[PDB]
Amino acid sequence: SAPVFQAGTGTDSTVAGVNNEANGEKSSAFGYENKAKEKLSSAFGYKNIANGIEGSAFGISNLAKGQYSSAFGFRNVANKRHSSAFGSGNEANGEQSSAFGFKNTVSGFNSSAFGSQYEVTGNFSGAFGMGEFNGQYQYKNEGNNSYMIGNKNKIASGSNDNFILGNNVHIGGGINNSVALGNNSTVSASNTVSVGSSTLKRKIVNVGDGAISANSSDAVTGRQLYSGNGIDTAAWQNKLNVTRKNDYKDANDIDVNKWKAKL
Amino acid sequence: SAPVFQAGTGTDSTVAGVNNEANGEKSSAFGYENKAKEKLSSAFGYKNIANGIEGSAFGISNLAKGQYSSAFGFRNVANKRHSSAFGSGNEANGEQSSAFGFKNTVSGFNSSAFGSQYEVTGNFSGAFGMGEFNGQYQYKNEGNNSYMIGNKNKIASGSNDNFILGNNVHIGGGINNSVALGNNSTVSASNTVSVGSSTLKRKIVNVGDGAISANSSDAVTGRQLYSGNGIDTAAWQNKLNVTRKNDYKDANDIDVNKWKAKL
Amino acid sequence: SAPVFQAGTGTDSTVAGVNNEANGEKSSAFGYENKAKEKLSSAFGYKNIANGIEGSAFGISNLAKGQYSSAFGFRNVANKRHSSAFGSGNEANGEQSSAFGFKNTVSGFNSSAFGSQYEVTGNFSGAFGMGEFNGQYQYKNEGNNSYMIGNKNKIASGSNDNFILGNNVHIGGGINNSVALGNNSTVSASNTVSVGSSTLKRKIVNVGDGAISANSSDAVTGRQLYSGNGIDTAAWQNKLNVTRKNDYKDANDIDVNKWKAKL
Amino acid sequence: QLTTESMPFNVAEGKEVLLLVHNLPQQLFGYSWYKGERVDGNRQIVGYAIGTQQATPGPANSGRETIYPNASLLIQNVTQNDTGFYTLQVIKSDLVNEEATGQFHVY
Amino acid sequence: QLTTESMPFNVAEGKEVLLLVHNLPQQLFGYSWYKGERVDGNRQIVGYAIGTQQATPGPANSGRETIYPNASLLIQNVTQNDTGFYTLQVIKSDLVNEEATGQFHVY
Amino acid sequence: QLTTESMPFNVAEGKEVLLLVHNLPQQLFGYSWYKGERVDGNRQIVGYAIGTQQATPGPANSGRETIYPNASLLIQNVTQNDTGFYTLQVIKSDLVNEEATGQFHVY
């Protein structure tokens, strides 16, 4: 069919291209075979559908179903309120969610995904990096208030308040308040910081001197163990039975009769 | 009014839709009631305004005021040069700034915000994650060369060169060169790394062995304190008054007269 | 020339504006002097070129050359399959790559750049933050499976599996499996975690108590060195020659003849 | 039209003052109470967020102002420095804003 | 049309079963094998990715199913609980999907 | 038209060589000096950035080349291997580029 430039079936609507239809009030369908179906909706490009109020579809084969939703690029889906899909093959099924990049799925409340092939199903969580996808997602972030940065990381359901900066870290169920640092690291308890695994261990370098006192929660360096300054002399002297030199030069605390016998 | 497809009031300008007006040279206004007012400016969608030279507004109710500025999505504002607003409700008031996601405000030079409800007012700073907004922003990044990753974090003014990876961390004034790790952590001094607070403390696990020498800034593990290998024997022997066995089997350094008396 | 609203040279194609040309099948060229040259391609705005199959150019002076490629904003370039450029002056020359912000270049496989003036030439790598550019890039990420967060950081070629969270950190050649934390930090070996440099050192605070046993890879706090609980008494008693008090009160292991002489 | 009502207009030196809101729009996002006639960052008393059901005090809070989940304000133990004008800001679900003004004088 | 063929249709209680695919489209992205008639997350056996040349088992794997890089499935040591329907999903280079169904019964 | 001038064209074996620029466009972003006739990454001497007012040497720097904030180059203690062509790249505020070429021979 020849292109047509006229009004649509709604009030103050406009269709511009080939086989376009605008059905809402103040709607715009520009391009090839686009569909705008609600109030104040815009469909620009090739075969774009806008079904939500104030929803925008811009590009190739995009869908904008939620209210105040935006789909920009190649084959993006926005479903909930204030949800944004930007790039190639992104879907956002959470309120106030953001999917940016290649093949990212977000289904939590106020969650963000940036990169390639991650799924975030937790609330107030975030993903930065790369995963895998072969029909189903194989690395997900299922914890609440947890964040992941890297490649091929996983957080289970029921494990909350976790932070991962590394590769190939898998946190199991029942672990809370933990931090994992490094590549190929493992976490197996709550309220811990891990810098390695049971097969490979790392060293912490360039550490300042702590305080040696009764109540001091500071790390200790090698020089402090080498020198021994600032320790409790009495505790070490009664932990290890020591005969003090001043009490040895002047005979003190001896059993006299036993020294009579041998001598 | 019926849609109209003709030229505008500028040289080589084009208006396409209902009640559009293009006033600049080589300008384009496509959609419903759009306004392009400068040179090489584009307004596509519903009620978009482009007031800057080479500024683009694409979507619903967007504003592009700066030179080489881009507003893409739902109700975005770009004000300065090379500033980008992408998503829903973002404003960028800094040169070479970037706001991506839902309700993010950036007003620094070369600063970036990704996520939901953060404000970055510092220079060369960055925010990744979630905050809060109820008319005013309640969590801001006001430091220079500082970065935040997580939920509900704050950096004050005058506190520079800080990095936060966690939740509910508030850095006060006068703190520089600090790192905070974990959830519900506290920082109270400069040149420190904190892995907990004064109510909850964390353990560092999977740490390799350090070096026990005169000048060694390496961490010490539990096995090294258990065994005691590599320490200075003389320093510990004169720190704790020890009578050596070889000097005890062979009577040395004794006060003869006092041993005469008791024996 | 006056604006023209008619069909193009392809099948079911559309041109709308001034001096537009659409040559592909089901192509759209809307705006000022746009060019769509392939199948299912869209050029919207000012002087946009779409040369790839299902490629989209939206904004001012954008180029979309790869298949399923997207260029959105001001002067963006997308070259490979599933590559996205969003913002101002971004180029993506890798398959499934993402450039977001101001002047970001990505040339790796599944790599992501967010911010201002970074280049990522490695595979499965990522950059978040700010760099520098004066004709050539002066800070690059050239490692595989490595991630950088901050300002002015560098990773060399051949250095893989590295993570940087900080400023002014330069990793040399031959370093693998390392983590750098803080501002102005240095790394000089493999399988290490660094929290400072050789001129400025940091302290680790708020650390829980470790375990003192034969095989315990946990950090030690100041209170444990102060008190000395849980150590091997025999190892310290034979490392430091101690004469035990119970063996001193009762004369044991003495050379009788030498005590005859002096006494 | 959004309206604000004070009760009572004239109050004693130790009583309670209650500010109510009539004709509040539906489908909102949050509220915020200010001091004076203009919306200012440094002159905010308290704010409320509906998404998380949260209330957070502002820089100009003394410890005597309470907000209720109907855009209602309660002030206790008023003094002679608490007399004058007050401003209310309402944010809707489309990110648009609304303003209202109330007043009361203490004797 | 994408087709799936079982060989043999009737198998013993300890032999091998091989499922082959004919008319496989070009320029693909990955494969995935399921159990039953519907594509379900909890009922996936194994999947393959062409970008990284990787094979990864799913939640419904026992240790007897092997995938080959031609969308072919091998099952060893079959029992009476392994009889019925199977589904194959093919993802293309444009992110569009295709489905196929096979069947076999054990005696 | 952007022009480059050498002074002096013929120089001794131990003197200084100064390269100046005339008709430099306004509203720029940075400069960069190369060796030869083409813009190459491995053959950069020094570059300047106006946003941060910064100067940074390149891979082909020996320690004798200085840049000035007017796109001017100074070379000291020249040898017989420093004779030939040089290229200047200018980046504008719109991200477009400009090129210029200079030359000098040492006796």
Curated annotation (Swiss-Prot), chains D, E, F:
Q: This chain belongs to which protein, by name?
A: Cell adhesion molecule CEACAM1
Region (Required for homophilic binding), start-end ranges = 5-107
Expression induction or repression? Induced in primary T cells by activation with IL-2.
Q: Which residues carry this modification: Pyrrolidone carboxylic acid?
A: 1
State the taxonomy lineage: Eukaryota, Metazoa, Chordata, Craniata, Vertebrata
Which residue range or ranges hold the Ig-like V-type domain? Answer: 1-107
Would you identify the family this protein belongs to, as annotated? Answer: Belongs to the immunoglobulin superfamily. CEA family.
- Domain observations: Ig-like V-type domain mediates trans-homophilic cell adhesion through homodimerization and this active process is regulated by tyrosine kinase, PTPN11 and PTPN6. Ig-like C2-type and/or cytoplasmic domains mediate cis-dimer/oligomer.
On subunit structure and binding partners, the annotation says:
Monomer. Oligomer. Heterodimer. Homodimer. Cis-dimer/oligomer (via Ig-like C2-type and/or via cytoplasmic domains); induced by trans-homophilic cell adhesion through an allosteric mechanism transmitted by the Ig-like V-type domain, and is regulated by intracellular calcium and calmodulin. Interacts (via cytoplasmic domain) with calmodulin in a calcium dependent manner; reduces homophilic cell adhesion through dissociation of dimer.
Identify the coding gene.
Answer: CEACAM1
Q: What is the effect of changing residue 42 to A?
A: Impairs interaction with HAVCR2
Q: What tissues is it present in? A: Expressed in columnar epithelial cells of the colon (at protein level). The predominant forms expressed by T cells are those containing a long cytoplasmic domain. Expressed in granulocytes and lymphocytes. Leukocytes only express isoforms 6 and isoform 1.
Glycosylation sites (chain numbering): 70, 77, 81
Give the subcellular location: Cell projection, Microvillus membrane; Apical cell membrane
Query: What species is given as this protein's source?
Result: Homo sapiens (Human)
The superkingdom listed in its UniProt entry is Eukaryota
